[PDB]
Amino acid sequence: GDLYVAGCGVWLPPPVTTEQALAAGHCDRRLASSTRMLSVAVADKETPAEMAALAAQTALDRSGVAPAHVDLVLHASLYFQGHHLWAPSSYVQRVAVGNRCPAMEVRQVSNGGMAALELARAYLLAAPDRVAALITTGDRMHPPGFDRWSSDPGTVYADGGTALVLSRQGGFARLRSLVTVSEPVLEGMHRGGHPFGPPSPEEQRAVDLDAHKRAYVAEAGSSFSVARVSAGQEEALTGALEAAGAGLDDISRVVLPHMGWRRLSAAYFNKWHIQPERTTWEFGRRTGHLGGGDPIAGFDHLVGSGRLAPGELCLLVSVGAGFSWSCAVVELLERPSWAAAP
Amino acid sequence: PGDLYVAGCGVWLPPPVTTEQALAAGHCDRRLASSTRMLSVAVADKETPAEMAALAAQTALDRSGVAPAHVDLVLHASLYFQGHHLWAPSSYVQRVAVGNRCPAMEVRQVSNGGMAALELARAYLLAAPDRVAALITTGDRMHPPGFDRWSSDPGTVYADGGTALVLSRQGGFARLRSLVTVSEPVLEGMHRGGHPFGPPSPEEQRAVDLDAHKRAYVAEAGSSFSVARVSAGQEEALTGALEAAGAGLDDISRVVLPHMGWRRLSAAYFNKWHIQPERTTWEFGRRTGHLGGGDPIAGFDHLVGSGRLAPGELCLLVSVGAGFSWSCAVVELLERPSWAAAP
Numbered sequence A: 001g002d003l004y005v006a007g008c009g010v011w012l013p014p015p016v017t018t019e020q021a022l023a024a025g026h027c028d029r030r031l032a033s034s035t036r037m038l039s040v041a042v043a044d045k046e047t048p049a050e051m052a053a054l055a056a057q058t059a060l061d062r063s064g065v066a067p068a069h070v071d072l073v074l075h076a077s078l079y080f081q082g083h084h085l086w087a088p089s090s091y092v093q094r095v096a097v098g099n100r101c102p103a104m105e106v107r108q109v110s111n112g113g114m115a116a117l118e119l120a121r122a123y124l125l126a127a128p129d130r131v132a133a134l135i136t137t138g139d140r141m142h143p144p145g146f147d148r149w150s151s152d153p154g155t156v157y158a159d160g161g162t163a164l165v166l167s168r169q170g171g172f173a174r175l176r177s178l179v180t181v182s183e184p185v186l187e188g189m190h191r192g193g194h195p196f197g198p199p200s201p202e203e204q205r206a207v208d209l210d211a212h213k214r215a216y217v218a219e220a221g222s223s224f225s226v227a228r229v230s231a232g233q234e235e236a237l238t239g240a241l242e243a244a245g246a247g248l249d250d251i252s253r254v255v256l257p258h259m260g261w262r263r264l265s266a267a268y269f270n271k272w273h274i275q276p277e278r279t280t281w282e283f284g285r286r287t288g289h290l291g292g293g294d295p296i297a298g299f300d301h302l303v304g305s306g307r308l309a310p311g312e313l314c315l316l317v318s319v320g321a322g323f324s325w326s327c328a329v330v331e332l333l334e335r336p337s338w339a340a341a342p
Numbered sequence B: 001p002g003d004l005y006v007a008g009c010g011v012w013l014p015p016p017v018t019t020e021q022a023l024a025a026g027h028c029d030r031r032l033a034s035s036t037r038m039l040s041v042a043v044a045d046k047e048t049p050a051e052m053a054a055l056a057a058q059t060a061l062d063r064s065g066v067a068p069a070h071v072d073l074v075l076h077a078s079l080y081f082q083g084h085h086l087w088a089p090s091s092y093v094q095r096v097a098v099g100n101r102c103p104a105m106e107v108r109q110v111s112n113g114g115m116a117a118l119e120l121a122r123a124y125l126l127a128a129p130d131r132v133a134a135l136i137t138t139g140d141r142m143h144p145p146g147f148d149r150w151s152s153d154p155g156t157v158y159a160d161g162g163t164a165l166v167l168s169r170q171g172g173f174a175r176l177r178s179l180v181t182v183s184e185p186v187l188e189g190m191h192r193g194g195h196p197f198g199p200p201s202p203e204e205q206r207a208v209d210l211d212a213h214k215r216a217y218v219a220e221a222g223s224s225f226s227v228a229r230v231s232a233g234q235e236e237a238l239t240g241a242l243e244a245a246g247a248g249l250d251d252i253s254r255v256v257l258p259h260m261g262w263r264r265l266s267a268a269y270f271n272k273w274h275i276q277p278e279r280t281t282w283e284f285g286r287r288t289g290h291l292g293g294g295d296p297i298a299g300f301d302h303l304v305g306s307g308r309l310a311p312g313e314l315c316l317l318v319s320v321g322a323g324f325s326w327s328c329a330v331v332e333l334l335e336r337p338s339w340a341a342a343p
């Protein structure tokens, strides 16, 4: 019944600094100041499945899991994967695993990685003989259909891949809890059309979330909008902590989404009263938002850098547009052979 | 004790466009009309994919009688653009059709997406002792800018519409006797640019053109290899599902096939398995078109609602998508639901 993290890894393209973004007029100084971002991973020619596959190779090698024991492949993403009517999950399988288990996509906007983890956990527990599952994420947020800095002001989107190997047999960390909360009444906040009617039939030029958020608040009211988002976040946090038998004071590290400083302050630092030094803030602000993969990149970072110690608890915090929230408590059991000692 | 049932199902299909009208507009030529033998395809005007999925889910949930509190998962499958980036179509389906707060997400596996979500839904319900039902939906809209319903993938004509199915552990009008999924990722490169066995090419900025990528894959990997590997996956899914249900093909009363053109179905199924078109959903699919990954649901819903399937009879669901992935399922009709015609 127990579930473990057997391996994890990332593939991040080289960073583009905020200074170089300012120089190119991709970012203004107000956004630079409000987000306090330092750099964002930006890919040149690598596409999403390629980057996911590269992360899966690292995660699988670190795990020591045989390909015959990978019983599910789930690839999560939030933006165009490059080729319509093509199966990026099958590319990840062919290149990174080389086996024949089911391989498919799971999507839940910036929460896709945790959504895939929920489905992976269920899949592994539904049959007594299953062993491990591979979860990957990958996205590429290029200039013609997406604006990395202002398509969704307050969050700077990154290119890159992440991967995690979940196992029933064992691993270096134990999953103590995972909870997902859904508040679909917020659905219309990220689309055109009436917030409570059907979606408008036209849009794919350049994502402009800011326009839709204001239209949603106008129709639903700021009071309602702020409250429901707050309530969803609180349900996921307290649900995960209660399921793990922990309180926030038992948590050593908090893996937060890689959003800008203003957003993280309002949602987490000034609400929960935690210090940034207890989170992945410094990592995320040089990385950027990796679509649905931030919890994986952040946990991988904490472990690989030795910032998390055996016996310590880690809290994964993730959120997506629907809205959907996931929180997980992960217990580090031992330092993996790939990790730096402090 | 582990058993799973179909409690409800439904579709929402926009008005049809006939092959004659397609011929007249120069969307279809006589050789394509003749090779596919399509009669019409469902075409949406202003309805978006999640809108159509939500309408189908309303019908399916109303038919099932399952309360929203017993819907413990919502999975929305699709194969083409859902209309809005960084937006959650699965949350729209939840808000409009369910009104609850269980997890809602997307599952995708090309033209096999509906059966893929069925696999994950089944695991989810079986992974915890108190779960009851799950809602599965599909929805797509294949419009002219980036897609040509008649020639983006010649030999299959793609439809607009939504489908929905309610899976339950408590009961239903049909029992899921078996469900198996087969994966051959070596065929992955057949549906993209680049190099079949290298990384994908940079972002596809044009109308979908699968014929180009299939020719490039066959040139590189060989026709003998491609045809054999595709044939082997289809045969594995078929015999796996039938063996898992304790049935042989002669025990199947009706086959729900994908809504491809006549030439593809003949080569894959009619001439291979020696089954009659009259035992399949051929007549239904040829007036509907390919509903992305919802065909098994639409075809099963058609068979049940029209009374062509009788209590005690077994039904075989057949699905395939690029990747490749294949799913087959055997479903036993337990009773005629009250919304179904008597034959």
Ligand SMILES: CC(C)(COP(=O)(O)O)[C@@H](O)C(=O)NCCC(=O)NCCSC1(CC(=O)O)COC1
Pocket (backbone or CB within 6 Å): A110, A155, A213, A225, A226, A227, A229, A230, A233, A257, A259, A266, A267, A268, A271, A319, A320, A321
């Ligand atoms: C949670 C709290 C911050 C609490 O606020 P108080 O301090 O006012 O109680 C809340 O009231 C709030 O507004 N949060 C920001 C959400 C919003 O309204 N619009 C943007 C939503 S974009 C997003 C995409 C991403 O992942 O980057 C999807 O979720 C993030």
Ligand SMILES: CC(C)(COP(=O)(O)O)[C@@H](O)C(=O)NCCC(=O)NCCSC1(CC(=O)O)COC1
Pocket (backbone or CB within 6 Å): B111, B153, B156, B214, B226, B227, B228, B230, B231, B234, B258, B260, B267, B268, B272, B290, B320, B321, B322
């Ligand atoms: C299938 C078979 C005929 C079986 O082998 P036998 O010919 O010996 O029977 C085989 O010979 C064959 O043709 N291989 C060529 C590949 C091909 O065209 N794939 C379609 C690509 S889009 C598609 C989705 C859909 O439309 O639903 C994914 O599957 C259809």
